[PDB]
Amino acid sequence: MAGTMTFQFRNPNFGGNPNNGAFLLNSAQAQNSYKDPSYNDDFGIETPSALDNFTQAIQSQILGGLLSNINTGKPGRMVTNDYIVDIANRDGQLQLNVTDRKTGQTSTIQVSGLQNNSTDFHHHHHH
Template identity: 30%
Template structure:
């Protein structure tokens, strides 16, 4: 085997090193946090990570799971109360819809119904505060329960 002198070996290594093409590119900073121009899809991940690492809890904070009613009796009472209120509101709506023009007072509420130009205007006034609401709708025509009826 032929022996290569160390000087020529060094020269070949240097020539091979400088003979290769060197490539480089600019360093580009890309922010991660969306508050500073980063990708907005990172926000949930960053918030989750921050909350997971948060060791300081608010002593006055209310756990949202404590607000859920789990007592079946109270759930039944609430469902019955909601159903009753819905039924009363429906009956009141039908009564107002079927009533003719005029002024009606129920407790601390005044209801004024007037018909003009094919429209029924219902003005509801809270007599205690003076707050008013105004509802304008077409006058119902036809027979209740049939198409085109009220």
């Protein structure tokens, strides 16, 4: 008698699902560049010979860092001209995300494994 469901079409617009490459990696030592840049780089950086697999082993782990470096934005950064020094201290590590202004490369320096603390308290002038 009653119109139970009948249409039952709700939830407008589905987005979709993404595919993944797993990126479980293998092993990358890279050893020798063999074709590294010469004369302001003619084509050395564009010849992925041995470093090829190494570069990819890094880009795979950068994907994880992207899940942290998007929650940054703290005012405690470093304003440098040729290098954008964004101090990504998140989670529990000092990740120094240096973005070059010239060519624009992401120099992500994860500071991990120092434990060398030189205690500094005043007396910054002694001869």
